[PDB]
Design an enzyme around this catalytic site. Structure first.
Site, PDB file in Angstrom:
ATOM      1  CG  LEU A 178      -1.980  -1.146   1.247  1.00 46.90           C
ATOM      2  CD1 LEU A 178      -2.828  -1.070   2.512  1.00 46.90           C
ATOM      3  CD2 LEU A 178      -2.888  -1.188   0.021  1.00 46.90           C
ATOM      4  N   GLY A 179       2.023   1.221   0.633  1.00 49.98           N
ATOM      5  CA  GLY A 179       2.918   2.378   0.649  1.00 49.98           C
ATOM      6  C   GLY A 179       4.169   2.077   1.426  1.00 49.98           C
ATOM      7  CB  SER A 180       7.393   1.900   1.433  1.00 48.71           C
ATOM      8  OG  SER A 180       8.139   2.496   0.389  1.00 48.71           O
ATOM      9  N   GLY A 181       7.720   4.422   3.318  1.00 49.98           N
ATOM     10  CA  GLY A 181       8.333   5.715   3.621  1.00 49.98           C
ATOM     11  C   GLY A 181       9.024   5.680   4.953  1.00 49.98           C
TER      12      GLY A 181
ATOM     13  CG  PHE B  69       5.018   4.966   6.859  1.00 46.67           C
ATOM     14  CD1 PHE B  69       4.698   3.751   6.226  1.00 46.67           C
ATOM     15  CD2 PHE B  69       4.906   6.150   6.122  1.00 46.67           C
ATOM     16  CE1 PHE B  69       4.305   3.730   4.895  1.00 46.67           C
ATOM     17  CE2 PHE B  69       4.507   6.129   4.794  1.00 46.67           C
ATOM     18  CZ  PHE B  69       4.200   4.915   4.180  1.00 46.67           C
TER      19      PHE B  69
ATOM     20  CB  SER C 241       7.268  -1.717   3.656  1.00 46.42           C
ATOM     21  OG  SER C 241       8.481  -1.157   3.219  1.00 46.42           O
ATOM     22  CB  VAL C 242       1.805  -0.191   5.044  1.00 47.06           C
ATOM     23  CG1 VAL C 242       0.417  -0.705   5.381  1.00 47.06           C
ATOM     24  CG2 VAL C 242       2.403   0.582   6.212  1.00 47.06           C
TER      25      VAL C 242
ATOM     26  CE  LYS D 111       3.394   1.198  11.184  1.00 42.34           C
ATOM     27  NZ  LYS D 111       4.781   1.526  11.612  1.00 42.34           N
TER      28      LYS D 111
ATOM     29  CG  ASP E  93       3.728  13.790  10.859  1.00 35.80           C
ATOM     30  OD1 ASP E  93       3.750  14.970  10.447  1.00 35.80           O
ATOM     31  OD2 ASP E  93       4.090  12.806  10.163  1.00 35.80           O
TER      32      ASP E  93
END
Ligand SMILES: N[C@H]1CC[C@H](CN2c3ccccc3Oc3ccc(Cl)cc32)CC1
Length: 273
Positions: free
Chosen positions: A12-15, A17, A19-20, A35, A135
């Site tokens: 779904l995304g990474s950053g 935070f 990888s999810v 996550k 945040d």
């Protein structure tokens, strides 16, 4: 038993935070988010009540995940030799507020009111539980499109709430208050209110009000979209340069712009269906 209990789906995304991934709990087909965070990249540790060494993120999530709220709940977690794995709720269908605003542009005030109210309730819940998010922003807010319900994510820069000064900050700079920029010092609640002002502006204008440090410090808000005098007033109050001139959460929620908020389901019918 992680690999057997959850069926893994697409990324779904990474950053910052980690990888999810999209996932399904095999037990009951519950949609989840999975996550992954590498141990190397965790600067912030704490301990559970029963007391093992975990990421502060797990401490904070455990504190806010009791009962219902506007926060994405932690369902379970796992330790691996080089990583931690968190199992989180996953609404379906879902879109983050950043993408939603990117696609639809500036939000009608009725829709912004509903969304902003739900964010306030979620932040209150966090503070009640002794957690400071640090945040709050459009990309850390998920929208359950069918129910019109907003959910906070990403406690990775968060901290235990306290009444003394914070001198560390790892959140998003353009949502960070002038006292942080100038003095590397802030208090929890008043800095949260600043970030809420930035959020509310973002919702009604479709972009953030300040890009550079000098504009944050100057604190002069220019509106690029037609916005009601009452909404402009609330935004300007949240974005008071002096922390003690900002409203409390109570004062925000009692402000005239915040009257007659739609329920989440009505918001979805009118604005999301
Ligand atoms: N701006 C971002 C881009 C990546 C996703 C990642 N995500 C997440 C990221 C970090 C902490 C918790 C998270 O919890 C989720 C729960 C449920 C879903 Cl569907 C997704 C997440 C969300 C929007």
């Amino acid at each position: 038993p992680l690999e057997s209990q959850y069926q893994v789906g697409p990324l779904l995304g990474s950053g910052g935070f980690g990888s999810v991934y999209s996932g399904i709990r095999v037990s009951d087909n519950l949609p989840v988010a999975i996550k992954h965070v590498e141990k190397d990249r965790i600067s912030d540790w704490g301990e559970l009540p029963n007391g093992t060494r975990v990421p502060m993120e797990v401490v904070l999530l455990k504190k806010v995940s009791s009962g219902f709220s506007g926060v994405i709940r932690l369902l379970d977690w796992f330790e691996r030799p080089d990583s931690f794995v968190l199992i989180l709720e996953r609404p379906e269908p879902v879109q983050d507020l950043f993408d939603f605003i990117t696609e639809r542009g500036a939000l009608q005030e009725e829709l912004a009111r509903s969304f902003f109210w739900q964010v306030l309730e979620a932040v209150r819940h966090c503070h009640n539980c002794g957690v400071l998010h640090r945040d709050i922003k459009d990309e850390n807010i998920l929208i359950d499109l069918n129910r019109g319900e907003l959910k906070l994510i990403d406690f990775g820069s968060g901290a235990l709430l306290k009444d003394t000064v914070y001198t560390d900050f790892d959140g998003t700079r353009v949502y960070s208050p002038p006292e942080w920029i100038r003095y590397h010092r802030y208090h929890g609640r008043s800095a949260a209110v600043w970030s809420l002002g930035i959020l509310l502006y973002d919702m009604v204008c479709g972009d953030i009000p300040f890009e550079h440090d000098e504009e944050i410090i100057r604190g002069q808000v220019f509106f690029r979209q037609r916005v009601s005098s009452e909404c402009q007033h609330l935004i300007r109050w949240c974005l008071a340069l002096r922390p003690s001139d900002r409203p409390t959460f109570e004062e925000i929620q009692n402000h005239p712009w915040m009257q007659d908020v739609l329920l989440p389901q009505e918001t979805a019918e009118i604005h999301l269906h």
